[PDB]
Design a protein around this ligand. Structure first.
Ligand SMILES: Nc1ncnc2c1ncn2[C@@H]1O[C@H](COP(=O)(O)O)[C@@H](O)[C@H]1O
Ligand SMILES: Nc1ncnc2c1ncn2[C@@H]1O[C@H](COP(=O)(O)O)[C@@H](O)[C@H]1O
Lengths: 431, 431
């Protein structure tokens, strides 16, 4: 293990932040490779809780350097605010954060377009986090968007900005019948922050090629989760970047032959935020329980999380897309006390077919019914348990069964939100 | 070597088709993972020449099955026409081609938008192949585009199509002041072809996971070339998909840990079609010669290829982005007879700095001057040479030097356009 990737196996919310922090004790670098300032990675260190959206989760560690790869659509505003919070708390953010000059820039008109498209989708709305992420990526593949490097030339910057905003404001005002966005506002706002950004630029592909030669340990930190991947997820209820392990190469520039171990963060039950298929969703007292003990309330309106049983058919898809090496089970404790726990092992098709493979497009997920395997729960607390011996036999069997159905071993078990409450059965760095 | 990727190291036109055909003698599968019907992969078998744009280059082989992965933006029209040509020639295309239901569909309004945006860019035009590739990808990341799977429900299909065309025709007619696109035309055209498409659908990620278990040999066929990659290329003079090896995972669904060998196709001199930086471009009699002996005239207007000396600084960037394993030198014969051959080994920056690393954004490539290494040419013919011994010492030294500067070995040497005229020093499948 030299290059270890950390990604979510489901639809997000599996607890990726804690595991990154925890493991970066040994890493020289942590790299974000996709998404935007919509991560929501929570860190609970000896009591204090930090929530990071853009800046990588290795930022609290002293020996590590954090980088934001070219796949990340970056917002100067969000970056500034997150830098301020961390500096206020005493974290010398400026001495250990580096970024790629190829990062697309997210700006006002993007959030504006994001709201616009959602409002317009009506009942077929996606459930976007509202941060203008989708539109920013859209600009990029269309080769019309700006990038951090564009900020080297203040003069040319203005010209480009002007041509872009002209096009967008048109669709806003004329098609969405929405407010236009002030050019001078954006321009001035960006210029103000412009010099903190460029001061931090670095050639990531080259830096990562060097680390590979020096034999440094590198940790990549994915956000969102596998089934929200733009290509392989439950399209269109999906995010606009590749969340799967392939996005590591594409979004940081490290050759695909150098990924050594891929850790899939697996929540003990399922969740989803926003619209979209969800075969094992619960609507009863158990659904209620998981939400409450899981503390799945959310950020704001519409950001309260949907809950359900673990879906072994969907996790199995995640296994192949990412060539997972091991899982990290999080929140087993939320299941504590239930009479019996369940887990989907196959899907019953509308026509009676029983399959073990997930459908591709949301429309095909429409009438699938989960086929469960029921097993006894456990009465004792598993929260904070630091040793395997302290886990009830019924809890161990649930674990054993996930390993059997998926073919992948559970290498780490998180028993609490604190860095200390964890069982590392196998260090990815030592594999 | 179980999983071998074949991609272009430069700006395209390196001769990828021949090498795919050649090597698929042993492969069970060949997979396209990006781009559209704009490949232009030429196959010269015992005299007959085939040019394929969409269908993979393993289509002429009897034992192989060709697949078009989810990364490929697909056009039913182009697919139909290419299927007809091949069937006419006697190739049973329908028995060995499979596609992914996640492939975005390119349709009329896309080509229409492509022309529109180019016409509008004026002097900063990109040089698009005009096939509506960029707009199709744009629709996809914005989650508004259609996919082959959408064709399962003829009813819903119409609804979606209608909502999409409504939005696009608006920007066309109202913003680009261009012709609107006929909804019923598109609709009927697609419905006609609709049943040949769905009959060929397959779950590629699952099929590739299976091949991995059976130990089958798989060949992935990239189109375009490394420096045209949307993320790491010379943006915006670039294509809209990832051409680098990372696009294999993202565009076919094979886990990144399963890529076994990456073959970089290296043309002995450089070329580029369309706008964009090009440090070693030639404007003299040599430029003229390379174009003429190389037969770099092209497809149509604007499709005549620019020529220049081999750029070892740019190739070195390709090496890291793709974790290349070996190169395949093509067209050494075009250099035959020149007095002396050159090769860029560093770049002189505007400010006098000498670097060995390529700049990222086109604007930074602006004032770079190549720093060459000159060496003697060779008078004898190398065309058709099947054995290393038959290569002049001066030609061997040119080869040796590419290996020294890049760190990667040249495993195959193509000495002619026919499958037979090749020197395989190391089979990727046996590595
Ligand atoms: N951090 C996240 N956790 C869970 N789902 C997310 C997250 N951010 C984005 N998504 C989901 O991805 C979809 C589109 O979001 P966006 O990335 O804002 O376009 C919605 O289903 C979002 O809820
Ligand atoms: N097969 C190809 N060979 C060379 N360059 C290509 C090829 N197809 C696309 N490009 C270039 O990619 C840019 C955008 O093309 P497009 O893929 O049509 O958007 C232009 O520089 C094209 O010349």
């Amino acid at each position: 293990g030299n290059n270890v990737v950390v990604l979510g196996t489901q639809w997000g919310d599996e607890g990726k932040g804690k595991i990154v922090d925890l493991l970066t004790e040994r890493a020289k670098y942590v790299v974000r490779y996709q998404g935007g300032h919509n991560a929501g990675h929570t860190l609970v260190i000896n009591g204090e809780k930090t929530v990071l959206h853009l800046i990588p989760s290795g930022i609290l560690r002293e020996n590590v350097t954090s980088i934001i790869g070219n796949g990340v659509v970056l917002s100067p505003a969000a970056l500034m605010k997150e830098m301020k919070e961390l500096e206020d708390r005493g974290i010398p953010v400026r001495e250990r954060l580096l970024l790629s000059e190829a990062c697309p820039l997210i700006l006002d008109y993007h959030v504006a377009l994001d709201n616009a498209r959602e409002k317009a989708r009506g009942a077929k709305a996606i459930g976007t986090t509202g941060r203008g992420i989708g539109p920013a990526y859209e600009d990029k593949v269309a080769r019309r968007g700006l990038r951090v490097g564009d900020l080297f030339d203040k003069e040319t910057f203005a010209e480009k900005l002007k041509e872009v905003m002209e096009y967008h404001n048109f669709q806003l005002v004329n098609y969405y019948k929405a407010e236009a966005v002030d050019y001078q506002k954006v321009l001035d706002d960006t210029m103000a922050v412009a010099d903190i950004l460029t001061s931090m630029v670095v050639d990531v592909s080259d830096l990562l090629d060097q680390a590979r030669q020096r034999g440094d340990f590198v940790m990549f930190e994915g956000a969102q989760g596998t089934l929200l991947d733009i290509d392989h997820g439950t399209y269109p209820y999906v995010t606009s970047s590749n969340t799967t392990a392939g996005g590591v190469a594409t979004g940081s520039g490290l050759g695909p032959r150098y990924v050594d171990y891929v850790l899939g963060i697996l929540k003990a039950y399922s969740t989803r935020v926003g619209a979209g298929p969800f075969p094992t969703e619960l609507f009863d007292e158990t659904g209620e329980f998981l939400c409450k003990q899981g503390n799945e309330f959310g950020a704001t309106t519409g950001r309260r999380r949907r809950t359900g049983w673990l879906d072994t058919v969907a996790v199995r898809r995640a296994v192949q897309l990412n060539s997972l090496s091991g899982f990290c089970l999080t929140k087993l404790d939320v299941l504590d006390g239930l009479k019996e726990v369940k887990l989907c092992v196959a899907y019953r098709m509308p026509d009676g077919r029983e399959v073990t493979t997930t459908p591709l497009a949301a429309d095909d997920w429409k009438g699938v019914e989960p086929i469960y395997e029921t097993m006894p729960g456990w009465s004792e607390s598993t929260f904070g348990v630091k040793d395997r011996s302290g886990l009830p036999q019924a809890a161990l069997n649930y674990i054993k069964r996930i390993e059997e159905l998926t073919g992948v071993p559970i290498d780490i078990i998180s028993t609490g939100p604190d860095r200390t409450e964890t069982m590392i059965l196998r260090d990815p760095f030592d594999a």
